[PDB]
Amino acid sequence: QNPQQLSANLWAAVRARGCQFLGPAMQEEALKLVLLALEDGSALSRKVLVLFVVQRLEPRFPQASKTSIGHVVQLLYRASCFKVTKRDEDSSLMQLKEEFRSYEALRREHDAQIVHIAMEAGLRISPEQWSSLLYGDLAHKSHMQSIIDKLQSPE
């Protein structure tokens, strides 16, 4: 598998799992809004989190929708970023775990989850291409290498 097939297969795999990556710039801003909502420990349902983000994101990125922001939220859920609460018949609320209440940390779980999906899908992808895929540059090679290590090997 050449680079072009790897990337196409990756995003198929992500969408296949009810998740979504919106592109490096858009996803960045999406995560920044999630964190704006949750960094102080507020506890929001899917509905309310989605509504919060989509209303701030659509002006700058008009392709944004409830569905697609739902999928990003799903990605972060699938990555165990949230403490989830339930009082019967209220909706499930999500809080960011304390350890993930910063852009750098949250972004690391996020990136890891996508890498995990590549693994579930049998897709071997180098750190250079990972940086390209998730950041649109090559300055995050080492950051991604580190994530691969932690997913493959016990520390």
UniProtKB/Swiss-Prot annotation:
Protein name listed in UniProt: Roquin-2
Subunit (UniProt): Interacts with EDC4. Interacts with CCR4-NOT deadenylase complex. Interacts with MAP3K5; the interaction is probably stimulus-dependent.
Annotated region described as ROQ, given as residue ranges: 1-155
Protein's job: Post-transcriptional repressor of mRNAs containing a conserved stem loop motif, called constitutive decay element (CDE), which is often located in the 3'-UTR, as in HMGXB3, ICOS, IER3, NFKBID, NFKBIZ, PPP1R10, TNF and in many more mRNAs. Binds to CDE and promotes mRNA deadenylation and degradation. This process does not involve miRNAs. In follicular helper T (Tfh) cells, represses of ICOS and TNFRSF4 expression, thus preventing spontaneous Tfh cell differentiation, germinal center B-cell differentiation in the absence of immunization and autoimmunity.
Top-level taxon: Eukaryota
Tissue expr: Expressed in spleen, testis, ovary and small intestine.
Domain notes: The RING-type zinc finger is required for proper localization to stress granules, but not to P-bodies. The ROQ region is required for CDE RNA-binding. Has 2 separate RNA-binding sites, one for CDE RNA and the other for dsRNA. It may also be involved in localization to stress granules.
Gene: RC3H2
Compartment(s) of residence: Cytoplasm, P-body
